[PDB]
């Protein structure tokens, strides 16, 4: 029994928590990502990258702290603590926004470690690892939003800053500049998420309300109830639960493809026939046109301060208004 | 075998293909009316003076729109909360011009939804099972009543109600965000947590069952309860915002010691809301 | 010489309805963009 | 609009549909 077998058995030994080989990648990376976020919110400010006060020392609130993204001038530099930017100076590394890269990269490797961990646990117990395949969706979302999107853009500056109000800013920015709500892939994502919630709710209620007076619930009564109330019903239990698994994951993957599309400005921003028809006559007004106008307004009123590095100067005259 | 008894045994019978029941007696006509009018007014319907300013806004398929951009425009701003029945209209063309079809659809649809909840309870009773599917269904019901009924009531006119269309929904969302800052309202955060967590728990439960099937009752109870509670909360949040009780506001919070103001993310969010709002509000 | 590995392909009615619903719903969603 | 928009929509509607119907028919004919 070489050192390797001893190490393997030691990893697989029962404890309060299971480590496994995956733990060697998951736990340090997850812990570092969490610590990076906590430090960035508690002490480091974004006064030099976004000109904001996003830390507790600054006096911010829990809803306004954020590990803000690096500056725009750095492009997609990895911002290593020992790179050409930081050059080993911790303070400059923090001020330049290196905590964002620290948190995001260690988060990527934590998610990878978690998926590997689910593979390993399912291998030990001896059941199909549908949990890992389910978790594949969140990894797709994470990779699409925090890596592929800022990589398709000018800089890391356009990535979602780790926070609450910063994420809200990201949502509104996406609507203003990419018109995301009109993207069909985001529509499939929304349908997937809302359908997953619907499935969870009605499945729970049905199982509770067809309980036997002692699996454990009257599948026959549930089937008849839904057939005569709604029209259709699951007559198979395995299909029912695989569908519950399948819907939200598919929604996440569709949204992921939508987000990678808008990372290249390959966005469904407008319908050509509507633009032409509005150009021909000014009376033609639909909800889509007014959405377009709202996008123009949000772009104009947010750009001077959101992308402060660009030194945008729009006077009051050029700002769109409802006159 | 009285004729009345025979009728009752027909309706309250578990041998129809679809259960009718006494609640379904109201559900069927109202739902059929709403569906028929929605189809007709979504395919072809004149432009509607949504702003009550003699200037119309079109939303039908035959007037240029497609499925993504088409909608059924809310009733005109001049009508207010007045019911506008066809027989209470000056002329059919005018009645369309003011947006009567929207009123017809939403009222029949809301009555049908509440009767559908009742029908769910009734059939659960007729089959001999605990009658709490309707309680779970009461959450999305509350949400629809919030956007279609309660919000216009708080705002004084149905012109502020949600349009019946895919792009109309988004326009409603953006105007609502502009005027009430819903994102920073804790109840919407509860709702977001509810839907995302409901999807998470659905995926976890499905994966576990389908992986091993090759108090555990409390598991399914929690599955049923979590998203329903969160949707109740977010529907109540929308309803409160219908009475100008807006969410959190942290604009202009940190100030420099001498007296200057240092920006935070909340100020960026407020400026985005400002853009959305100034693009709204045609005049002032 | 026959191939042992041949197996038929099965698709019941319910699966047909599910597939048709998926296809028709996707077509309805994406036609508004295909026509652009 | 795109002259090929209608054709793309029609083929999208049709090809998976005929595939599924063919599979179901050659299933149901078999016992």
């Amino acid at each position: 029994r070489g050192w390797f077998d001893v190490l393997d058995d030691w990893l697989k030994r029962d404890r309060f928590v299971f480590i496994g080989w995956s733990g060697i990648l998951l736990f340090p990376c997850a812990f570092l990502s969490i610590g990076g976020w906590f430090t960035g919110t508690t002490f480091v400010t974004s006064w030099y990258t976004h000109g904001l006060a996003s830390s507790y020392l600054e006096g911010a609130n829990f809803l306004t702290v954020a590990v803000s993204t690096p500056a725009d001038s750095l492009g997609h530099s990895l911002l290593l603590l020992w790179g050409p930017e930081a050059q080993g100076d911790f303070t400059r590394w923090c001020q330049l926004g290196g905590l964002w890269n620290f948190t995001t990269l260690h988060g990527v490797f934590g998610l990878i470690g978690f998926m590997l961990r689910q593979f390993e646990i399912a291998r030990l117990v001896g059941v199909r690892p549908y949990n890992a395949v389910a978790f594949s969706g969140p990894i797709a979302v994470y990779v699409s939003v925090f890596l592929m999107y800022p990589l398709g853009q000018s800089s890391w500056f356009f990535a979602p800053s780790w926070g609450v109000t910063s994420i809200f800013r990201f949502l509104l920015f996406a609507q203003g500049f990419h018109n995301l709500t009109l993207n069909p892939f985001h529509m499939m994502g929304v349908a997937g998420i809302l359908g997953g919630a619907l499935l969870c709710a009605i499945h729970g209620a049905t199982v509770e309300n067809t309980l036997f007076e002692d699996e454990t619930y009257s599948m026959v009564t549930a089937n008849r109830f839904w057939s005569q109330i709604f029209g259709i019903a699951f007559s198979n239990k395995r299909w029912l639960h695989f569908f519950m698994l399948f819907v939200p994951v598919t929604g996440l993957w569709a949204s992921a493809i939508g987000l990678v599309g808008i990372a290249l400005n390959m966005r469904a921003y407008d319908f050509v026939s509507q633009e032409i028809r509005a150009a021909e006559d000014p009376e033609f007004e639909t909800f889509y046109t007014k959405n377009i106008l709202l996008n123009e307004g949000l772009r104009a009123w947010m750009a001077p301060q959101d992308q402060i590095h660009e030194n945008f100067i729009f006077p009051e005259e050029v700002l769109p208004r409802g006159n | 075998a009285s004729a009345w008894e025979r009728f009752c045994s027909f309706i309250t019978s578990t041998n129809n293909r679809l259960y009718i029941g006494w609640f379904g007696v109201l559900m069927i006509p109202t739902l059929l009316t709403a569906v028929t009018c929605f189809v007709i007014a979504f395919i072809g319907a004149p432009p509607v003076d949504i702003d009550g300013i003699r200037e119309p806004v079109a939303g039908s398929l035959l007037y240029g729109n497609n499925i993504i951009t088409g909608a059924v425009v809310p009733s005109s701003n001049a009508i207010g909360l007045h019911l506008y029945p066809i027989w209470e209209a000056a002329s059919l063309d005018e009645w369309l011009y003011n947006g009567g079809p929207y009123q017809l659809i939403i009222f029949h649809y809301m009555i049908g939804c509440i009767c559908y909840l009742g029908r769910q309870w009734e059939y659960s009773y007729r089959l001999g099972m605990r009658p709490w599917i309707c309680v779970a269904y009461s959450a999305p019901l509350a949400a629809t009543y919030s956007v279609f009924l309660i919000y216009p009531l708080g705002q004084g006119s149905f012109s502020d109600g949600m349009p019946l269309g895919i792009s109309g929904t988004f326009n409603f969302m953006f105007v609502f965000q502009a005027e009430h800052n819903i994102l920073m309202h804790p109840f919407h955060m509860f709702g977001v947590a509810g839907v995302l967590g409901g999807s998470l728990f659905a995926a976890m439960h499905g994966s576990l069952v389908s992986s091993t099937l090759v108090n555990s009752r409390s598991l399914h109870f929690f599955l049923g309860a979590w998203p329903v509670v969160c949707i109740w909360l977010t529907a109540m949040g929308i309803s409160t915002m219908a009475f100008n009780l807006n969410g959190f506001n942290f604009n202009h919070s940190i100030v420099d010691s001498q007296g200057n103001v240092v920006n935070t993310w909340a100020d960026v969010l407020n400026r985005a809301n400002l853009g959305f709002e100034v693009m709204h509000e045609r005049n002032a | 010489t026959p191939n042992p590995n041949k197996q038929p392909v099965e698709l019941n009615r319910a699966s047909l309805f599910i597939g048709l619903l998926l296809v028709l719903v996707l077509a309805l969603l994406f036609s508004s963009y295909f026509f652009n | 609009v795109n002259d090929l928009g209608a054709i793309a929509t029609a083929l999208f509607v049709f090809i998976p549909c005929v595939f599924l119907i063919l599979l179901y028919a050659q299933t149901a004919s078999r016992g």
Partner: peptide, 28 residues
Amino acid sequence: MDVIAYVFILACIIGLFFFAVFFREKPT
């Protein structure tokens, strides 16, 4: 003509609902 495409897809969906409701193979 887009209207025809939309309406045809919608009518096919409704027909699918009719057949899925009244002609499903009996669960057993």
